[PDB]
Paper text:
In these pathways, β-ketoacyl ACP synthases, alternatively ketosynthases (KSs), catalyze carbon–carbon formation via a precisely choreographed decarboxylative Claisen-like condensation to produce a β-ketoacyl species. The small, 4-α-helical acyl carrier protein (ACP) is used to shuttle substrates and intermediates to each catalytic domain or discrete enzyme in these pathways. Here, we use this well-characterized system to better understand ACP·KS PPIs and KS substrate discrimination by structurally characterizing E. coli elongating KSs, FabB (KASI family KS), and FabF (KASII family KS), as substrate/intermediate complexes with ACP that approximate states formed during catalysis. Specifically, we propose that the elongating KSs employ two conserved active site loops that open and close through a double drawbridge-like gating mechanism in order to regulate substrate processing.
Author numbering:
A (entry chain B), B (entry chain B): 1 to 77
C (entry chain A), D (entry chain A): 2 to 412
The structure:
Amino acid sequence: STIEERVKKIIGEQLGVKQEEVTNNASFVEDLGADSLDTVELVMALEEEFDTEIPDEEAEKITTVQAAIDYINGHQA
Amino acid sequence: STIEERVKKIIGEQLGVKQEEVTNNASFVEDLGADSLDTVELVMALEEEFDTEIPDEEAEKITTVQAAIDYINGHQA
Amino acid sequence: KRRVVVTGLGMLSPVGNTVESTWKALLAGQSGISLIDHFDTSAYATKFAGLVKDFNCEDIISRKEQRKMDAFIQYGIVAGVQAMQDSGLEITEENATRIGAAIGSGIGGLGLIEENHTSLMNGGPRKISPFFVPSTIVNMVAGHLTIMYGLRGPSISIATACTSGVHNIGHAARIIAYGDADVMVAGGAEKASTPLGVGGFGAARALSTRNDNPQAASRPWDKERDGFVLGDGAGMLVLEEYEHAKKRGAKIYAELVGFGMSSDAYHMTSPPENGAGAALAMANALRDAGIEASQIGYVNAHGTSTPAGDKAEAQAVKTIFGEAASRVLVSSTKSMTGHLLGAAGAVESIYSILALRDQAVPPTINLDNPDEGCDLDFVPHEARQVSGMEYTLCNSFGFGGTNGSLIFKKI
Amino acid sequence: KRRVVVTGLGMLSPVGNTVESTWKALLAGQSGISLIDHFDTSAYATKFAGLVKDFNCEDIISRKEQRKMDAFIQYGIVAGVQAMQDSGLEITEENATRIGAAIGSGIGGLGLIEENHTSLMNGGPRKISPFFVPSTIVNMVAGHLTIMYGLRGPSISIATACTSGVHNIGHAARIIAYGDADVMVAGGAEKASTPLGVGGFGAARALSTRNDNPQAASRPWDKERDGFVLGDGAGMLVLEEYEHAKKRGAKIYAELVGFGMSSDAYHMTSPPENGAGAALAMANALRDAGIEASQIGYVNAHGTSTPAGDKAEAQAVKTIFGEAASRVLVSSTKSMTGHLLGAAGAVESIYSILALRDQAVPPTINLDNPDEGCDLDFVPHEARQVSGMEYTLCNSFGFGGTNGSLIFKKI
Ligand code: NA
Ligand code: NA
């Protein structure tokens, strides 16, 4: 359905926010009320959704919605 | 190693008795100090040891060492 | 001496999602046992349980937070919120350090234990959810409830298998009477109707296998009983020091006057016979309350519908009551709800309290033919109306484990 | 008022399989952390833990009965037998109803939970062992110990995660002081160093990942700390009413004079800051013992070597002690043993007692560079000799959960 809609949807379900609030510049902790374990569970959901392994050193750099969009985009090749 | 030695060994390990005491006429509860859950675990060990399924209606009839010997013998065919 | 009263009730049970709806269904003799359908029971010897129907906690627990909770945690939170709302207690910064909890469970979060271990064996430890531990351990019902209401007083979690319900309630009263708290929310929660649960208790040959008629499977003291029936749910009580409750004009259901404990000192595979452990816990509760056994009007029995345990319980009632054994009313609400395990003592304490309020006793349904030596008034089939009842006794017995007894007094 | 004394000690720890061997190793600053080898840790971010080495219980528990017990149950039984043997208590039919237990655990039988669920997913429910439930639930340590010694008094099992140790010991003293028992064996046991355990706590990012140097990973209040280290073991104490112990000429290690409880009312993902919950539990223990904080000579801290929790604990000690904060000795034996979770409070109560007997304080090893604001005397590197110490304080803090504090008095 495009990966951005899929990524934004995953973030929406994980953090319990409407898709209206899942903006590209949104910070998981600062804007969407996620704690440190919420972001861990969120990265796991991205892995299971796209059948890709995200190294935890790269997972820590996924702080915003745009970051998760960029990672799943540039790792399907 | 013959199934009788294998069966007698399984009974010996399960009920914590030396192979000297695992006689053919020995009753699990009356002679070898097994409670009702010990005999259940023992029948499970016989199943896993011989890769055979023992219906629980037939498992209840396995009360002595000779009974377990007879069942594993006449069900390898 | 600081007295302890009950000022709030909350409950989720196989026969209702509130206290009053459950109490109405039990007095009507309604069964809450049905066939399991949330997992394939084709390979399971027991295919039925006492399930919480139509459970919707979205107004209390968001979907995001539900995923961090096993079903037994969701049940205890909902029942805890009901009890807190029923108490009308206003938590401030001043009294927060004087309010705590005593909430336990017998088996805990089997469902999410199964799920996290399945992910582990399929994808290694990187598939385990970070919320695995806090979603499964039995103490997280109190953990969430203390956070939701800002409770800072003493909080414990007693996990003593089928006696966790009365132990948590009884030691909540001990904490209040000792002076460490003025209010405590106590009880238990359980959701063992899972593959590991039904399979685990079924492996121990403890469960009834009457799959052809589940509503008649739980038959305490009946000659055709063949094991207990699993039941899910949660029971919560708000315990409060008497003068504290009176000053704030609280509603007062009953007073907790006695709490007794004992141990059996034998395995469940050994004969219980006369149930000396059960009698010892009841005697300690009577001594703690300072009343004679003849003053007890109703006894909410353990009565799990197991062959040996039911008979041993009837003997323990005969020992304690003696001459008055023929007059006291005994009944097992597990005949309708099933065995709620760690929450059984909690929901059954609520029944013993409501029995005082309404002067009515719920029945032991499915008691078609009592066993030899089970000649007590077990209130079979239909509920009993009583009058002038001042004391009720709530029992949780291990018959191979610990025992707990609570005595409640009207007003 | 009934006073409660300690008359028996038993312990299994990563640095010794007896009380005295552990106490000697801790005073020598010996680490008990090593690499895990009983399962493949290649895919695990944390590959080390505080393990019980050279464990042999065949003289106490037969191989047949061991298969019905998770490793944490075997540990608690062995430690319980040691404590019972150390007490020299002679159980008769007369005093059996006055002897009980209060033994808990934080996570329980993970090992046999994993094994039974693996059999389930591979062969259905008919592969679950009939002993699955009694081999995994946290209350079975007390269950076995009561049966082994014929104990019939009150028995409970408090499971409050990292604070189970002090809660079980503290409420055992409450049960004795209330009058429901004269002797209680209390403590906890843990064996979480399993795939689900190391993976579960590792999924929550709680564990240190210093696989290149495990003996330096647990460094409470050090600037390079990165999480706690798992530790297995069990600690058991025989608590006894004072006059009961004196009449039988019992050996008396110390008197339990204070027990305090509190709740944090916030999740572990939220900042603890000043640790108001930890301070509240310590203040309740001081009020319960009726002593000032300046009379405490040594504080066995929680000190799990976590970044936020360690700093919040130092602030709570500053709040309680105030002027005397610069003089009191604080130390985390978790720097050597690791975090024994539900058993941490139990083994650390034994350390606080032995600190009174020998007038020596074990160190906080690996404290190379303390953090800003961690300017307390944490007894770094080597043990401290003291004199005239009358009171010690044993703390278990949740920093997102419950808290427990115990105060012991010499003789
Ligand atoms: Na009952
Ligand atoms: Na400590």
